Amino acid sequence: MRTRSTISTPNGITWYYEQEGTGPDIVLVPDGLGECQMFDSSVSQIAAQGFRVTTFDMPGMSRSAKAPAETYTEVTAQKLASYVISILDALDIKHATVWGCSSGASTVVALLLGYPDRIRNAMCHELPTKLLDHLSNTAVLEDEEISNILANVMLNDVSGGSEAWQALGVEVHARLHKNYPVWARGYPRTIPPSAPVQDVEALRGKPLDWTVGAATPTESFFDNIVTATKAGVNIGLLPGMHFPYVSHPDVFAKYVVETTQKHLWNSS
Amino acid sequence: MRTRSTISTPNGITWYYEQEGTGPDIVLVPDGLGECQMFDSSVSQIAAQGFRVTTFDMPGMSRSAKAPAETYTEVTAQKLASYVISILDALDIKHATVWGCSSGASTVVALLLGYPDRIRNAMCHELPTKLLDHLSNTAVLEDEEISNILANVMLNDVSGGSEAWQALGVEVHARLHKNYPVWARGYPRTIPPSAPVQDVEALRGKPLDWTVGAATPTESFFDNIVTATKAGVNIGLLPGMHFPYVSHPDVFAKYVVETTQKHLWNSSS
Numbered sequence: 001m002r003t004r005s006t007i008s009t010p011n012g013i014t015w016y017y018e019q020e021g022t023g024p025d026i027v028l029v030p031d032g033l034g035e036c037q038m039f040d041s042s043v044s045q046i047a048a049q050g051f052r053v054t055t056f057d058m059p060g061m062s063r064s065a066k067a068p069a070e071t072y073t074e075v076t077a078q079k080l081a082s083y084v085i086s087i088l089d090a091l092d093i094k095h096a097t098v099w100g101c102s103s104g105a106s107t108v109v110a111l112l113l114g115y116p117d118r119i120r121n122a123m124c125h126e127l128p129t130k131l132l133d134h135l136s137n138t139a140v141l142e143d144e145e146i147s148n149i150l151a152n153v154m155l156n157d158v159s160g161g162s163e164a165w166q167a168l169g170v171e172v173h174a175r176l177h178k179n180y181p182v183w184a185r186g187y188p189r190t191i192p193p194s195a196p197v198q199d200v201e202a203l204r205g206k207p208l209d210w211t212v213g214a215a216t217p218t219e220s221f222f223d224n225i226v227t228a229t230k231a232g233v234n235i236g237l238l239p240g241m242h243f244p245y246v247s248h249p250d251v252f253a254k255y256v257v258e259t260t261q262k263h264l265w266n267s268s
Numbered sequence: 269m270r271t272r273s274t275i276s277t278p279n280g281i282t283w284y285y286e287q288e289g290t291g292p293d294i295v296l297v298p299d300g301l302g303e304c305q306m307f308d309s310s311v312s313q314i315a316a317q318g319f320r321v322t323t324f325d326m327p328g329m330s331r332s333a334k335a336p337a338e339t340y341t342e343v344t345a346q347k348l349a350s351y352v353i354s355i356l357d358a359l360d361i362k363h364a365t366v367w368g369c370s371s372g373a374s375t376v377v378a379l380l381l382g383y384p385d386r387i388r389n390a391m392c393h394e395l396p397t398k399l400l401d402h403l404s405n406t407a408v409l410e411d412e413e414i415s416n417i418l419a420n421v422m423l424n425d426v427s428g429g430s431e432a433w434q435a436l437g438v439e440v441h442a443r444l445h446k447n448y449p450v451w452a453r454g455y456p457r458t459i460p461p462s463a464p465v466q467d468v469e470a471l472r473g474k475p476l477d478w479t480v481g482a483a484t485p486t487e488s489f490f491d492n493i494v495t496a497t498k499a500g501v502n503i504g505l506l507p508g509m510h511f512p513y514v515s516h517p518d519v520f521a522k523y524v525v526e527t528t529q530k531h532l533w534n535s536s537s
């Protein structure tokens with residue numbers, strides 16, 4: 001029942017995407033690694049509740065690598081939001097619920113603020129607003145050292161579940177291996193300063209639901225809790241750390257379905 | 269030089285207390301384990317910046333164990349605040365800056381709200397507001413089972429620094445071993461519901477500075493960040509987890525000194 005295909009947008013990107021289901025649109029935007037196979041289990045569980053679920057590899061990453069260099073260098077939330085609107089346009093998705101973690105979180109808040117008529121509601125998880133020099137500094141290393149450093153960070157520091165992370169399988173980890181240097185060179189130096197959470201009053205009353213990982217060290221996304229609370233935005237936790245859709249797919253799917261259902265009720 | 273002595277209060281407690289320095293009073297209230305040797309390095313560093321620093325073991329715990337049963341059973345923030353005021357009265361400490369973590373955090377917020385004339389400013393760290401059934405359930409086990417379980421929890425789950433925690437040494441850990449069953453039977457069922465942070469508007473504008481451990485899992489004191497932000501109370505992080513005065517004593521001491529200095533400036537302003 002899964003459609004697995006490609007679509008070309010006039011910004012030069014040939015996207016790999018997947019779709020499943022019929023009903024209101026739910027779009028799952030990847031984290032910075034850009035790898036939509038991380039949503040595989042959850043896409044079927046969400047679609048089975050009466051939704052059309054769409055996800056895709058991000059430009060320059062995995063199977064969406066046929067893209068111009070501007071789409072995967074000096075990347076900002078605003079660039080990514082423009083790229084996601086281009087694929088929604090191409091797929092004729094007029095009104096979508098959106099999820100994103102990491103740069104995906106920055107993307108979905110930029111989508112909700114920038115394109116309000118297009119976005120039913122946004123779920124953001126672990127939105128990066130701080131420059132971390134130790135990750136910025138990986139951008140100047142050789143590709144093999146970047147892949148080794150970041151593969152270890154994901155598995156041992158922020159996966160929220162090392163066994164589920166490894167169980168993504170050899171093919172996915174081979175794609176991630178190639179994505180690590182693209183991510184290092186294009187994301188950590190430019191994504192955090194582009195965070196669309198400088199104007200707290202712009203977030204107030206918006207259909208935004210914000211999460212942090214329950215096991216994430218407090219320091220990592222402390223600022224997300226403070227910002228959400230200042231804006232009166234719903235803020236809570238999902239199990240695990242940076243990849244709840246990998247570590248806890250059934251909890252993740254239930255959250256996405258229940259949050260979408262809450263906004264469908266409110267909308268009527 | 270450090271005073272190390274005992275003093276009795278008319279509520280029946282014989283306190284073990286330590287004091288060092290001259291200047292404005294800073295009082296370091298222990299966490300639930302009630303063991304003031306955890307502050308030993310910090311007391312000297314803080315006192316050296318021009319403060320009189322006082323600390324003590326808590327009633328029923330460590331060297332303050334000669335105390336009536338009411339002082340270490342059915343413990344609440346408000347009971348602990350009344351006990352701390354008793355020792356501050358006994359030591360003629362009229363106006364104090366106070367620090368506390370855990371049940372100590374609940375105690376210092378209860379002190380600031382209940383005795384505003386006595387408290388210059390309060391620093392609270394990791395204030396418990398939720399009942400945890402797995403900790404409340406230790407109370408029915410045998411003393412040795414409680415000590416073994418909670419010694420392991422403190423080292424592995426909340427110390428913030430296994431080397432520093434173990435380096436407290438045999439004397440301290442032998443006192444903690446005896447305290448674990450007292451704490452388990454007296455604290456976790458009654459402290460969280462007593463949290464004095466249910467009235468958010470009562471906190472607004474108060475001289476309160478709130479911290480959580482940087483490495484603490486986000487779930488543990490998520491509610492503290494939310495509450496502090498709702499109240500407009502200063503909220504930030506210290507290195508480590510539940511025992512920054514053990515894991516990072518020099519950072520802890522600098523925080524206490526700088527926060528006290530900030531409020532001395534504001535008090536004159």
Ligand SMILES: C[C@H](O)CCC[C@@H](O)CCC/C=C/c1cc(O)cc(O)c1C(=O)O
Nearest residue numbers: 032102103128132135187188191217219220
């Ligand atoms: C206090 C912490 O525990 C210290 C270690 C934090 C480390 O493990 C986080 C690993 C995932 C990185 C996200 C991130 C980082 C960055 O510098 C820029 C970004 O754009 C991102 C992003 O896009 O998500």
Ligand SMILES: C[C@H](O)CCC[C@@H](O)CCC/C=C/c1cc(O)cc(O)c1C(=O)O
Nearest residue numbers: 300370371396400425455456459485487488
């Ligand atoms: C989501 C988290 O990771 C789950 C694990 C949290 C666990 O490891 C922390 C242990 C520290 C507890 C202090 C405390 C707690 C309490 O419920 C009542 C009290 O009275 C106190 C007190 O007296 O100090």
Ligand SMILES: [K+]
Nearest residue numbers: 248249250251
């Ligand atoms: K699950």
Ligand SMILES: [K+]
Nearest residue numbers: 516517518519
């Ligand atoms: K230190």
